[PDB]
Structures are given as C-alpha cells and as structure tokens.
Design a protein around this ligand. Structure first.
Ligand SMILES: [Ca+2]
Length: 108
C-alpha cells in the first residue's frame, strides 16, 4: 500500500488498535503502521497520497478523515484526536500540516 511504503498487514493492525473512539494517537499509529522507520522520501510519498488539497496542506477538518485514507469505511477521528494530532504536527503555527510538518512529526 501507499506506493509500496506500507504493507496491508501492518495497516490492518494499526486500524484495529485504534477502533475505539479517542484511542488514536498519531505516534502510536505511525509506529505500528511502520512509517516511523521509513526514509523521508517514503514518508513524503505517504503525505502526498494522503493530502487531498491541491494547496499541499492538511486542515484539521481533513485530519478527521485520516484513517479513511487507509480503509474506506474506517471511523472518523474525534475532535479531541484531531485537535491533538494538529497541535503536535503543526510546528510552524499556520493551522495546517504541510509536508515539512508531516515529515518532522512522523520522524520525531
Ligand atoms: Ca503548519
């Protein structure tokens, strides 16, 4: 999956780990799905696939649909989860996550 960067089994396990509302954590997910150990180049590919906006930036509203990039009928993140995700990843403060924010977040 994701241009071969992630394998189906890891993704399945990561989604099962966070089925419960408010059980998602970006760091836990990145680890389990196996992205954290990937090269920046692969990490950035994952970002480009995930980001829906031609602007190149992911808004909080879109983060809500985060798991649905991995499985179409996955749950939406809760507002608590998206708030947490956004605060951790928006290193520069513009309210969004760009590729730079994403790469730093994943690999930190
Ligand atoms: Ca930002």
């Amino acid at each position: 999956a994701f241009a071969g960067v992630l394998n189906d089994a890891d993704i399945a396990a990561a989604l099962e780990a966070c089925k419960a509302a408010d059980s998602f954590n970006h760091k836990a997910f990145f680890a389990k799905v196996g992205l954290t150990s990937k090269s920046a180049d692969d990490v950035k590919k994952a970002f480009a696939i995930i980001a829906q906006d031609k602007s190149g930036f992911i808004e909080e509203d879109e983060l809500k649909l985060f798991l649905q990039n991995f499985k179409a009928d996955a749950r939406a993140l809760t507002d608590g989860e998206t708030k947490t995700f956004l605060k951790a990843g928006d290193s520069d403060g513009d309210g969004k996550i760009g590729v730079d924010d994403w790469t730093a977040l994943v690999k930190a």
